[PDB]
From a paper:
Eukaryotic ribosome biogenesis is a complex, tightly regulated process that involves many ribosome biogenesis factors and spans different cellular compartments. Here, we answer these questions and reveal how the nascent 60S moves from chromatin to the late-assembly compartment in the nucleolus of [name] ([name]). In vitro, [name] binds DNA and nucleosomes but dissociates to bind nascent 60S particles and to partition them from chromatin through LLPS. This partitioning provides directionality for the nascent 60S to move into the nucleophosmin-rich GC, where its biogenesis continues.
Author numbering:
A (entry chain G): 88 to 120, 125 to 237
B (entry chain D): 320 to 335, 346 to 359, 473 to 501, 512 to 534
C (entry chain o): 102 to 210
D (entry chain K): 5 to 28, 50 to 256
E (entry chain t): 51 to 249
F (entry chain m): 199 to 247
The structure:
RNA sequence: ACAAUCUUCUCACAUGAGGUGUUGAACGAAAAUAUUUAGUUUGAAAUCGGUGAAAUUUUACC
């Protein structure tokens, strides 16, 4: 819930908001008439996988139950390889609602405003201590067999 | 290795090829603040990335590349070839 | 049986003697609780020692609230074995700490 | 003369300078003792004690925290040409949000030399700065820039640079910065007299009568008593 | 259960509330004294668990022992001061004659012999308030709006109203902690509109 | 079922995987919203929106 | 219900009088006399260290 408390600040604007905003510029141009970089969360498998490789991602959150598991099975290794702090968040539909979609296979925080830069750093140290510091060794054992 | 520029920036203030161009571009425009401006400026970033290419090529396995990039003002070492 | 004693570190501003007691009570009864504070102004030192009736209960908390991200702080709590526990981690425990107004009493004096 | 119908200054100031040079800049601090409490509680606001010889070096970089928006003040600094002195202007809102942690606040403190503040912003400055700033010998000053004009800002900056900074707290004795060792003895004496007039006017409740002892020293020197109350 | 976070939140509120009282009382013994109305209207928006001792007594002193209670107060120096003390918990304003009319005529409740008694009969009003020249419900409203000599007695007799927030449309029955966006402090005549929605 | 062996990922790779530069797309205001804006203005002028 | 009210200014008259708030820990300054008190280092780091208001005890900035 703490991870998603931050994420729900950087939700990309909906197709409803992306239009109501762009009409305002259009009427400003139509009568008589520049900004700052839009800050939001990065989603999409190809887009995110590129970001880790380009080392532009600060934190990766991997949906735990992707149907063909081929999609994300390589992700923890790759994020470990590039040194990107990652976590396997429960359920895709939680990650789906952050971006206004039915489902998201993976999210990634790439850059936040200075105001929330301290919160992200606090969370990243928690994911280190609660996800990667814990387990770690258990990730190298064959699951199941119960 | 990660503070070479900082010493020169401080000393110059107290006593106020591509690598030479990179130094002038930042000096005219002017650690996290230095890394922020370069990553937010397109023309400055091209000079900074070029500067690391020249310095590493001019100088091999001894220098700490990650600290070298921090000296120029980049978060991580760029994917420079040799 | 065996008196479990627990340490809690990196206290968020607010998690003070009463707040901890009303929280750890539902985990189990808490007998003697002290939270380290500044000698002069009684300000928080942001780390407290608590006691539990059994080490088994004392180790119960140490595997849940350890690395508990709270208000941006990673709570540090783990069982401190009894070999090195001192006599008075709870000297004045469960007692409203006295902060004396040193400045004003000087002006009155 | 105001203190005890006499002014045993100048000669004492010259002797202190010779002693400091002999015992081979170190600030010049005057130790003053009062018969009563100067303040009933800590007062975390500056005392704009104007002096002829400033103690703040002219090479010091200044950051002037202003009320929002920062663009209006930033444009004012550009118009007035004080950018050589006014290093950075940060709005009150941006000060609260951008710099929050203890680490970030420490760096945002050490990144400048003197942190001036607007008259309408000095109140909330007690927080959003923390003990990192308000207790590590870097307190804000109330620069009056409410007029919103280049001349008003320029005059305030000049006055702020040329004025000493003091922050009274509930006690009986306090030390005020009077200058540096490199400063001339005559200039230090003039500054000391100016502070003494300010001390009796708006600091000491009983004026010179309330002042019990006056002594001067450096940071590590001995507080040689300049004068004592005869009564 | 109760999480470790809510214990913090109570403490942060309690110190936030306690510091507000010190600044309000000390160095700020000044009240702007809303004018042009002898009669105000005060309702309690919310309260904080583990109440401060000062506010706990003061709210009882104003009969607002429970949330959503509605009480009339005669405007003066003393009353406005206590309201200023408990300002972050109460939404207060100036009711109009009509708004006071519907309050008594739709939610007015009496205290006959000390039980929860509806003002269903004018005989009961005359029985308990005859000696103060109060005979009818219309006598009550005229007295209250005019704040006559018997204003204190009538206000003592009146049981506080209960303006529980209304939930009709589907969006309200689902949004969490919906209170119609009730702020805290002065609201002018917006309290009249709030009453109109509420009554 | 041997324990997982990481003969490649045990070390952290400092350089980014790709060497290509950053195209100026990622520093200039969006061109794609400009097509949308100018089409949005045109409908307003021609009375469609 | 990890949400809440720490003030983007006031008073007298260009001037004067105000604004009450500061995470902990460690090395260190000698002076005015238990209050202030040079310079420092750090993950908001950490592992013993007089006075009431209520039903004899309850206060966790009185």
């Amino acid at each position: 819930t703490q991870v998603f408390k931050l994420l729900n600040k950087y939700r990309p604007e909906t197709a409803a908001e992306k239009k109501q905003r762009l009409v305002a510029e259009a009427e400003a141009v139509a009568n008589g008439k520049v900004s700052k970089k839009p800050y939001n969360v990065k989603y999409g498998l190809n887009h995110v996988v590129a970001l880790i490789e380009a080392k532009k991602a600060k934190l990766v959150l991997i949906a735990s139950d992707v149907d063909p598991i081929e999609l994300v099975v390589f992700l923890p290794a790759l994020c470990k390889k590039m040194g990107v702090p990652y976590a396997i968040v429960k359920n895709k539909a939680r990650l789906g609602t952050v971006i206004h979609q039915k489902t998201a296979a993976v999210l990634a925080v790439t850059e936040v405003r200075e105001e929330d830069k301290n919160e992200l750093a606090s969370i990243v140290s928690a994911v280190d201590a609660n996800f990667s510091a814990k387990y770690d060794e258990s990730r190298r054992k064959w699951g199941g067999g119960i | 290795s990660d503070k070479r520029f900082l010493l020169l920036f401080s000393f110059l203030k107290r006593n106020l090829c591509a690598s030479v161009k990179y130094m002038a571009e930042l000096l005219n425009y002017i650690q996290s603040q230095l890394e922020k401006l370069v990553s937010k400026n397109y023309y400055l970033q091209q000079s900074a990335k070029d500067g690391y290419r020249s310095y590493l090529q001019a100088y091999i396995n001894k220098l700490d590349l990650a600290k070298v990039a921090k000296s120029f003002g980049f978060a991580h070492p760029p994917n420079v070839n040799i | 049986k065996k008196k479990g004693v627990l340490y809690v570190g990196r206290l968020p501003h607010g998690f003070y003697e009463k707040q901890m007691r009303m929280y750890f009570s539902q985990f189990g009864p808490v007998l003697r609780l002290r939270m380290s504070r500044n000698r002069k102004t009684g300000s928080s030192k942001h780390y407290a020692f608590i006691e539990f009736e059994s080490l088994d209960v004392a180790n119960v908390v140490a595997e849940t609230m350890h690395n508990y991200l709270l208000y941006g702080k990673l709570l540090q709590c783990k069982v401190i074995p009894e070999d090195q526990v001192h006599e008075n981690m709870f000297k004045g425990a469960d007692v409203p700490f006295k902060r004396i107004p040193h400045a004003t009493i000087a002006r009155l004096q | 003369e105001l203190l005890g119908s006499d002014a045993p200054l100048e000669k004492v100031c010259s002797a202190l300078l010779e002693y400091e040079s002999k015992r081979k800049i170190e600030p010049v601090w005057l130790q003053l003792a009062t018969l009563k409490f100067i303040g009933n509680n800590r007062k975390l606001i500056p005392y704009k004690i104007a002096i002829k010889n400033p103690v703040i070096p002219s090479s010091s970089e200044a950051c002037l925290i202003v009320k929002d928006p920062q663009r209006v003040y930033k444009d004012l600094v550009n118009e007035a040409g004080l950018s050589k002195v006014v290093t950075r202007v940060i709005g009150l809102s941006k000060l609260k949000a951008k710099w929050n942690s203890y680490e970030q606040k420490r760096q945002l403190r050490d990144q400048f030399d003197i942190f001036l503040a607007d008259d309408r912003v000095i109140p909330m400055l007690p927080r959003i700065l923390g003990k990192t700033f308000y207790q590590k010998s870097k307190v804000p000053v109330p620069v009056k820039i409410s007029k919103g004009t280049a001349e008003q800002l320029k005059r305030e900056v000049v006055s702020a640079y040329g004025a000493t900074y003091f922050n009274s707290a509930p006690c009986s004795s306090f030390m005020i910065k009077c200058g540096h060792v490199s400063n001339t003895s005559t200039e230090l004496a003039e500054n000391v007299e100016s502070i003494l007039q300010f001390v009796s006017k708006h600091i000491v409740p009983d004026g010179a009568k309330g002042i019990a002892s006056i002594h001067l020293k450096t940071s590590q020197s001995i507080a040689i008593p300049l004068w004592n109350n005869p009564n | 259960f109760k999480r470790a976070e809510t214990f913090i939140n109570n403490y942060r509120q309690r110190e936030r509330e306690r510091i507000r009282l010190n600044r309000s009382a000390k160095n700020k013994g000044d009240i702007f004294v809303p004018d042009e109305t002898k009669l105000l209207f005060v309702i309690r928006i919310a309260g904080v668990k583990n109440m401060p001792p000062k506010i706990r007594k003061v709210l009882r002193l104003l009969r607002l022992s429970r949330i959503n209670n509605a009480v009339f107060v005669r405007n003066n120096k003393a009353v406005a001061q206590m309201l200023r003390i408990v300002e972050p918990y109460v939404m207060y304003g100036i009711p109009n004659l009509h708004s006071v009319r519907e309050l008594i005529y739709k939610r007015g409740f009496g205290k006959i012999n000390g039980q929860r008694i509806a003002l269903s009969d004018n005989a009961l009003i005359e029985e308990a308030l005859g000696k103060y020249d109060v005979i009818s419900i219309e006598d009550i409203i005229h007295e209250i709006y005019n704040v006559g000599s018997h204003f204190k007695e009538v206000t003592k007799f009146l049981w506080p109203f209960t303006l529980t927030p209304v939930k009709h449309s589907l969006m309200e029955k689902k949004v969490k902690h919906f209170n119609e966006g009730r702020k805290a402090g002065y609201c002018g005549e917006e309290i009249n509109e709030l009453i109109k929605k509420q009554v | 079922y041997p324990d997982y062996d990481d003969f490649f990922t045990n070390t952290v790779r400092e350089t980014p995987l790709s060497s290509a530069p950053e195209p100026k797309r990622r520093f200039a205001p969006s061109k794609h919203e400009q097509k949308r804006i100018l089409q949005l203005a045109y409908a307003i002028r021609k009375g469609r929106i």
